[PDB]
Subunit: 61 residues, 3 copies
């Protein structure tokens, strides 16, 4: 209704690339800084900044 | 079990208005700034701010 | 595909303590401050601070 939404959201997500979904989950579900996210993943901060930017465009298509 | 909660939750949430649900996910699941969210929803910040404010009330009572 | 994670994940946030689940949820889903979360839960901030720290650790294990 209601559930109709989260549903479709839940699926975007899942339509994200493995990387963007990881990046977004790290920074939003756990809510790590980009710094902490980048330590977890072992990449430049810029990398996460990017994966999340694109996750966000993806999700607001 | 936790299993109970998450469903416990996601029903509450599903539940919300629509416009709260949108604001909340836009800011917590997307982690968009109020300003950015407001841009996305074509309404002033104050609005986004209070919608999430209400989203927190329905979730916590 | 991309659901394989959301379940792997959401299956994890089910394992967490509950006291960890709560903390993490309030601060990340509700996007509450630690002070607010601590308030809500009836504990000092230090405890929430750590609960979400352990909470984060567990889901990254």
């Amino acid at each position: 209704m209601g559930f109709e939404d989260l549903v479709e959201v839940t699926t975007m997500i899942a339509d994200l690339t493995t990387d963007q979904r990881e990046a977004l989950l790290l920074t939003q579900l756990l809510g790590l800084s980009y710094a902490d996210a980048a330590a977890v993943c072992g990449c430049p901060v810029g990398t996460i900044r990017s994966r999340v930017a694109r996750a966000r465009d993806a999700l607001l298509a």
